[PDB]
Amino acid sequence: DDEYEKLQVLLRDIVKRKREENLKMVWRINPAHRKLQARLDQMRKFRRQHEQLRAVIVRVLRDAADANAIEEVNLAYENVKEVDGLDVSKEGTEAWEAAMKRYDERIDRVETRI
Amino acid sequence: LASFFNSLLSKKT
């Protein structure tokens, strides 16, 4: 991002120095890695609270309800885990969204149970 | 601070 900003500054001050040789000048840039960047942002914003919940759950919930809760937490993490979230393609994106919805429903059920 | 022991001394003079 910062190297691209410095380079974009360089293109700005060269196109203002090249006015008489250019008639049309647009700045439409859509880099392909920004969707990947959003995917890893969403992946941290899943994994952080999953780790925060799971460490607490395996720490302090040592009845069959607690074993049910830890097994359902493991099942939610495996159900998200079995989906390849690194795919920036559309079908992988919808699989990621479905895994997120399934994980959220499982987590809210576990939350109400505890 | 110097006054303290100066007085200490002038007791008998």
Added chain:
Amino acid sequence: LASFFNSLLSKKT
């Protein structure tokens, strides 16, 4: 600094 005044004292006691 102990040693030096210590010498001061034991040097002839």
Added chain:
Amino acid sequence: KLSLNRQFFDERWSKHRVVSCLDWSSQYPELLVASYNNNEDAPHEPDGVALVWNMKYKKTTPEYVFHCQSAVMSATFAKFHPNLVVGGTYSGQIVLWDNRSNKRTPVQRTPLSAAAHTHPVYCVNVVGTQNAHNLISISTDGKICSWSLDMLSHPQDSMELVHKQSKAVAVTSMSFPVGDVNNFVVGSEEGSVYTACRHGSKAGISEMFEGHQGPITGIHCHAAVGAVDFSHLFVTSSFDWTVKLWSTKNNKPLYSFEDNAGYVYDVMWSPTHPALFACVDGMGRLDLWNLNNDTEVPTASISVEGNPALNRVRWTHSGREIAVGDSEGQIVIYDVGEQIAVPRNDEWARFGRTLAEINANRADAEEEAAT
């Protein structure tokens, strides 16, 4: 249930004095010695004074009166001579009283030399057997000397309990495990239980036990014997408003009991029920804790009328009665019910499940605190 049984007071002697030690004779289980501090109102009266009371008779007068010129604050019977009463005073003499002699003056006393105690003595006890036993006394300066009970003018063995580049500890309490003569535990004014050995290559203070933020005022090893051994446990009391249970295999306290709203003075185990002890506070509330029932609420607690500070507490050898000693001077005695005092068959096994659970809870709490 907890109920009142008897009340003991003497207007001539026990008035305006604080009880300082209580004991029940093993040979005569109906007897109770006592120890009192000086009377500030009457300097002509003796400072130290010991009284012997009785259970069998109805008489309000004490059975024997002993006194000393210095304030006695630690008194006990002799385990293998029934005619002797040992006292430890403010000046550091270890006086010996005899009921067979007709004199209330002490018939023997240790010298006030540097070989003996010169600081006050708060712990006096006799350990050993019938054919071999000594008298053990630790003063406040950490000096512990052993005395033969037939010849008192010279200590047998003497050394000072030190730690942390040989700084003297301030021994305030004392206890002995059952069946042990060489190993024992002490309290401290410095807020830390030590383990000590009488004789050996590491004769002296062995280990830190850490966890009390106030001066420890009373310890007691476990005494009830049954199917499963529990002699490695002991309970301490302190000024930190807590009663803490410890074991000799752990560097940390097992459980802290925080039901009080004031200083806690003594605690000692029941000699019959394995998971039962009693504690006293500065508000006259003698509490009873049954560990097989609950670990946060006293099983039975009663308050002394007028609410004085209870210095001492001491069970009987039967375990059916319990004697407290207040700050004005009346030895109040309660008798406990059969539903609390009597141990059942699985009580040792129930406590054998109890302590482990307690330790697990402690571990959980500590991990939580760490995180």
Added chain:
Amino acid sequence: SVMSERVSGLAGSIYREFERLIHCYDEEVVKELMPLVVNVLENLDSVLSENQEHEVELELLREDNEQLLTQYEREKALRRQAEEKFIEFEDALEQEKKELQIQVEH
């Protein structure tokens, strides 16, 4: 130059020893030692008074460092928020003015 409690306490102990040595032997003990002591005693108060100024300056300038760092970071972030809204507005309304230009050209 306000004297502290600690310098007053140790000067009181010096006063004790000097009175004891005056009473013990004679007057002639103190007559050259007390001017060699009082200047050191003044130096203790001077170095403590300078040290406390050092401490308060350290605290105020330290907290001004942590003020500066986060203020600069927030200001850099809000400059960035000015610097992509410019780009998004620019290419969006340039595309709209270009479609307006070609529709008015035909």
Added chain:
Amino acid sequence: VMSERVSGLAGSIYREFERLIHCYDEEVVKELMPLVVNVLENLDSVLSENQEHEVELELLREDNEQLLTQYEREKALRRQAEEKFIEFEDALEQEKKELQIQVEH
């Protein structure tokens, strides 16, 4: 390390102590040793603490001045960027609505 002003005043009380020891007896300073070594050690230790405080003070003052200057430059850049943004805003919107009144003609 022993500081030189404390060393000089130490030498002053050393020759004074030699004078009082040689002049009367050996019990002149038997009650004076652990007082005076405490006083001299106090002066030395507080002066060493002052010496640490001085050098850490100069370090944090220097990068404080640097941070102040760079933050002021960041203020200048931010204000310049906002002014350029609002100018380009108004100018492009101005000729855009001039284009649409030209459209309506």
